[PDB]
Design a protein around this ligand. Structure first.
Ligand SMILES: *[C@@H]1O[C@H](CO)[C@@H](O[C@@H]2O[C@H](CO)[C@@H](O[C@@H]3O[C@H](CO)[C@@H](O)[C@H](O)[C@@H]3O)[C@H](O)[C@H]2NC(C)=O)[C@H](O)[C@H]1NC(C)=O
Ligand SMILES: *[C@@H]1O[C@H](CO)[C@@H](O[C@@H]2O[C@H](CO)[C@@H](O[C@@H]3O[C@H](CO)[C@@H](O)[C@H](O)[C@@H]3O)[C@H](O)[C@H]2NC(C)=O)[C@H](O)[C@H]1NC(C)=O
Ligand SMILES: [Ca+2]
Ligand SMILES: [Ca+2]
Ligand SMILES: [Ca+2]
Ligand SMILES: [Ca+2]
Ligand SMILES: [Ca+2]
Ligand SMILES: [Ca+2]
Ligand SMILES: [Ca+2]
Ligand SMILES: [Ca+2]
Lengths: 387, 119, 387, 387, 387
């Protein structure tokens, strides 16, 4: 039955580890897809790990030059959580170099973006059947969340961006129902920049935490209801969430231009005026990951926080991070619980290999005892194909 | 044709052991039964044991059970016979002799399986 | 429940990409069948990719000399769409070096042709149970669609050809019900040649678009109803659909002899007097692929067309193409939607390898925004086994 | 619901090919079990391929010396038909170096024999739950059909042999119900020898065709009813069915001593006084396979037959063969249809390798057009592990 | 429906072999997890093999130094019995270097322990959803059964240990209901030491047989009811069950200090004052395994026993062993039948390799004929990665 989604976020006091696939380590021997931009999304019965393959396997010559994010060979596929993304256990979803997926409660909705940079087309599938398409309106690379979309009452929502990555672009909110786009609104957000949003439903509405790749070291956000009336803003906290960023300092409810140039996909969970912030430990590279609870970070500009939980050691590689929720329909609770995943990027550009891939770890929020630690990728690079 | 080349002569004190080699300088070796027969001077032929290298099975006469060991080397096409606890009555000429026909196909291999058409 | 099939073809205005398996690329490392002649067919619940294996894996010595289309080792197998045809995810269907398969709505029907060239026998299976056989009646290699058959009201139809590939042969229509051949008619089509037909149901009837390997650069077609009363003819369009062919010129409603010698398996969708034509971009070799909408091409002989959508670049390898439909029982629509797949042949005879195999792409027709692009195989040849 | 089994054998006039797994060919690259003694058995829903693994994979050093039929590492496992026996698609049944399995209509019954040669114990499982055991009663290797057992009315029957393989042994019939041995009878058959029987139900009774390894070149048989009252005999036909055997000559209703020494597992289908005989083409080695219809071969001693259908060419390796039936519960017919499988042994002792394994082909009887051909293993030996 | 668990243990007179996966042997070629601490647990429908991976595959460089029991890469995963623990057939359960799992009758309960040594946290999952957590209360490595937990009437119980492995530690009993910890009691057991308990339900109560790593060569035990009222003690039999141990001598109902230093995970089944003891054959190393029936061993101190059944030869490697039961809901019997598994550790420290892994064998108790034999690992070490 449909996912109601009228519950508020469960309030959380930590993070318990949920899954770790150990892909790249197992990829040194097994047959493992070269992947990047993975994300988790759950149905009222199970959770799956979606990812963008490169049409090639690790330790294979076809994994050469797989830095390039866009090729006609990339495909969106999914496998059970904690499992390695192998051709023998992965289900095909769509041909895409930019993707998003969520479950309205009755069927998997997948959004796959492929085509040329000037004419990219997003293919929408509901139960694997093509239900709708949408073509780039700015003719500059069309891209989407790279994380799960948010479904409420039977309608699922997502964010897409068309235009420059280093300047003012065009951003849209969509309201899909059974794979058919029923409403869309372009956001009137001058001087804002939205990319790779992490959207989660919260008490019949949706709030997306996104990445400002143009002039922002804090994260922009947009919240909206089913009618797509929206409000925009930036996380005011002096605990900056993007990477790169400056050191913790006085924040701003607008874009912070210092180290405001290109960033990393991330997420945040808003609790009133507070915010759970997931970010890298390093300020320059994509190293380490941690969760920080700022009780006034959503509306306040100071750098004070009360809780910090280690996720990945500051010396070890991290990458994209995104939110995913577990609805009461799945958990039996009375509130929609938040969780998140972390991508562990290995190889190029930072390492001496011919390839780039990533593994994943995931955590779910609980109101009980937790602990901080380091759950890194763990692969020993370079691989045999790199010699 | 096939030629079986044995090791040179041997002299042993009692209680010691001896090992004689049998190099099949030909084709047959793998699927063929090899027997070891000894003959005391001026006496009759006495069969000690046999081996089928492809099946890894051996069959020993009841007189030599416990102190005879017949092994094979599929790589070098060589057979071996090792007799321990040597007594003066073991003084004899020791022959190794291949069988005449290829071993039959045995799906249920008995650990002591052996066949004999003629050496 | 049975597949009614009384709906007309949905009218289409483009093609959205449906799947891409990236077989040969993943075959460089993983365990992947050496395949050829793949095709997609759908049930009211799922879609599958059928293919004829060679009893061997890519990058293995047993893939030597696998040009020969007929051997006792070739088997018809199937795996989910967009998935790599591996022995670890492929279901066995039948021993065949020529096959066809379709779903009447309650069970998979598979047709496998094996045996000697003079005595070939087609084994018919319904739910994997042998239900009927049919033997070569002209003792010259017996062959069939190599694409999905067409089911209407519970009865499935196919085409088989017996006789010479470079001359006049014998062609028969069959009407299978639960795997049992219930009626057959030999077509009286002198000077016609039918091979590897692409049949789709259209409002209680079936129209097959086929390949004229004897003297034809346009495609022959045959349409029939449940009683197997049949029409024959050739696509009149001056936009020639076979490969090789001549340049676009004045067409003919009969076989066009110029470059009429051996061709390639193809398809077409008739809409009134118009036709959607899928064909290679090159005139001599099997390179590139494109979809062309000729609004009067089914009955008119001019070379004018109004719409063309790129599928595979003119420089990259293409191969067999075939139609497959998605019935309202599966999609929930009110008309049977058309789709198609493209085989991307790699290796011999055009490339310096010891093997020949193929990957697949597929597209489904939508009445919405689409884009043309190039989705090629992408494998870097030769492979390590070829040195 | 239970499998009634009161239908007579369907009368047949040929054999249509059912499956071919191409194991050893795919085993050169993929991860494939080193197997031997495979057999097919069907439920009222599906058919499966059971086999005895060697706890090792092809082209691996652990496949060394795998001639020896008995080791603590051999296990009975099963996979879908026509599929390769890989650890990624094989279901575990029991630890066994001699096995038998059949489906009473509600649950898989499996019989696994392991242990020492003097104390072998057959483990009986019903739905994977150990339901009974039986210990060797003559302390000389305990062995069973290596093909499917036969179920009637809810009771399944098998044959086991305890004692010498080159002389008089002890033979017992069992009547298992839901995995529990409820009745057993030792056969009073002096000068008879029974090994590796191929039993099939025939209209509420069972007739087993077996292998005389001691002094028999024709095949011994035993038929019995639910109360295990039995009749014994040998196939009288002068078309000898064992391998080795003499040339076709005057047969005998008793054991034929000429070339009566060790044989090969086989099968036969009795139709009144006629018999369908499956046997190798060669008289000395395990080469080729063919089906021969002798209309009076069950009770007559002449060498005349009326129908012969080629299965495997006389020059190519063959091996064990066994019967398996498809009940009306599965096929919807009004009679229990007969089928058979053929093991294609590759490697030792006949070939220059360090291993022995086998693939499988299978055929089902139909009353329609068929053809003879050669469907051999096809693997190019030696493999890379043998250098 | 819930697992009642009010039946007593079925009385047994032997052990019939249930499964053997041949992992390490197949790991030489196939893609197989480097595992350790495997155990079997059954639902009312199936049985599964849980295990702690090392995030690496056999014969891969990432299997180097995999002696260390604790790393951020170890994960609790499961696959069907007798199947090889491959990433292509294994289901993910939780991130853990110490685990326990059982089925209450409606959903799999899994307990995964990860984190630092001073702050380890056990993540509890019910149907893969995180339902509870519990943190280390003594800040010295938190560990659990490494075998199945025991469920009665819908409540599942387990044992956890916190503190020194070479001295007095803290031991707690838990009562989980639908993955939620509802009651816990710390055991008042001075001079006792509990580690890696093998718990089985027995007529509405639970009795765990454990490992005394501090000063015990006999096995400690603790039994409790649903209210967690408990009784403690040691197996009094002079047939010592731990490894290392002294020779069989006069036993004690307290800890036997002679060879009382570190031991091996084991199990035992109490029947009145009799006990079925599973132990290694060697007194010093982990070699061989056997089952011993001592009719008065539970309360008596003599070394006399009446039955002994060989499991693994004294010369071949053995390792962890644990109990697992099959409830009447699964077997249809009127009593809860006992079974057990044996881990076969290969590699370090005893062998010249860079890795440590294990395979498994399992036996189930039957009141029928059985036999003793040796079912060892069988892998030929070292592997190619060790050169
Ligand atoms: C597979 O198993 C067979 C056994 O069935 C192994 O054969 C053995 O091969 C070795 C050489 O590889 C033989 O050893 C030799 O011994 C002679 C002395 O007799 C010595 O002079 C040589 O230098 C060499 O060490 C051994 O006798 C032979 N054993 C048998 C029973 O034939 C084979 O090596 C195994 N191959 C693999 C790849 O595992
Ligand atoms: C794949 O199959 C082809 C056959 O289609 C194999 O080709 C054959 O290659 C061998 C050499 O590798 C050729 O043999 C040569 O014969 C000449 C005499 O004519 C002799 O002087 C040379 O020393 C050599 O022995 C053989 O003629 C050729 N056959 C054909 C029909 O082309 C090829 O070897 C196979 N490759 C693999 C990897 O399986
Ligand atoms: Ca930025
Ligand atoms: Ca603050
Ligand atoms: Ca042509
Ligand atoms: Ca036109
Ligand atoms: Ca015989
Ligand atoms: Ca006759
Ligand atoms: Ca101890
Ligand atoms: Ca005692």
């Amino acid at each position: 039955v449909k996912l109601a989604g009228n519950s508020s976020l469960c309030p959380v006091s930590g993070w318990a580890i949920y899954s770790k696939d150990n892909s790249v380590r197992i990829g040194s021997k097994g047959d493992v897809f070269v992947i990047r931009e993975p994300f988790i999304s759950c149905s009222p019965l199970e959770c799956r790990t979606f990812f963008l393959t490169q049409g090639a396997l690790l330790n294979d010559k076809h994994s050469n030059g797989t830095i390039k994010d866009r090729s006609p060979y990339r495909t969106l596929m999914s496998c059970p959580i904690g499992e390695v993304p192998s051709p023998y256990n992965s289900r095909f979803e769509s041909v895409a170099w930019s993707a998003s997926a969520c479950h309205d409660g009755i069927n998997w909705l997948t959004i796959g973006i492929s085509g040329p940079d000037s004419g990219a087309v997003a293919v929408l599938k509901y139960n694997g059947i093509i239900t709708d398409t949408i073509k780039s309106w700015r003719n500059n690379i069309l891209r989407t969340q790279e994380s799960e979309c948010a479904c409420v009452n039977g309608s699922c929502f997502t964010i897409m961006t068309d235009g420059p990555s280093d300047g003012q672009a065009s951003y849209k909110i969509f309201r899909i129902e059974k794979g058919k786009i029923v409403k869309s609104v372009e956001m009137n957000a001058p001087n804002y920049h939205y990319e790779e949003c992490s959207c989660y439903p919260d008490s019949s509405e949706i709030t997306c935490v996104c990445r400002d790749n143009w002039h922002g070291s804090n994260r922009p956000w947009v919240s909206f209801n089913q009618n797509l009336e929206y409000q925009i803003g930036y996380i005011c906290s002096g605990v900056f969430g993007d990477n790169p960023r400056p050191n913790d300092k006085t924040g701003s409810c607008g874009p912070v231009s210092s180290n405001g140039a290109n960033g990393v996909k991330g997420f945040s969970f808003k609790y009133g005026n507070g915010v759970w912030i997931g970010r890298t430990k390093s300020i320059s590279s994509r190293k380490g990951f941690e969760m920080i609870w700022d009780p006034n970070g959503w509306t306040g500009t100071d750098n004070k926080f009360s809780i910090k939980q280690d996720i990945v050691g500051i010396n070890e590689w991290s990458g994209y991070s995104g939110s995913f929720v577990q609805h009461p329909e799945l958990t039996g609770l009375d509130c929609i619980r938040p969780c998140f995943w972390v991508e562990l990027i290995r190889g190029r550009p930072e390492e001496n290999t011919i390839w780039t891939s990533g593994s994943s770890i995931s955590f779910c929020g609980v109101n009980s005892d937790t602990v901080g630690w380091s759950w890194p990728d763990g692969a020993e690079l370079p691989f045999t194909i790199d010699k | 044709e096939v030629q079986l080349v044995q090791s040179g002569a041997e002299v042993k004190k009692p209680g010691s052991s001896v090992k004689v080699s049998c190099k099949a300088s030909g084709g047959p070796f793998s699927s063929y039964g090899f027997s070891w027969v000894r003959q005391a001077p001026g006496q009759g032929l006495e069969w000690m044991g046999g081996i089928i290298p492809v099946y890894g099975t051996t069959n020993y006469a009841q007189k030599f059970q416990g102190r005879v060991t017949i092994t094979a080397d599929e790589s070098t096409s060589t057979a071996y016979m090792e007799l321990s606890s040597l007594k003066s009555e073991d003084t004899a000429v020791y022959y190794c002799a291949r069988d005449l026909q290829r071993t039959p196909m045995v799906d249920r291999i008995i650990g002591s399986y052996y066949y004999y058409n003629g050496l």
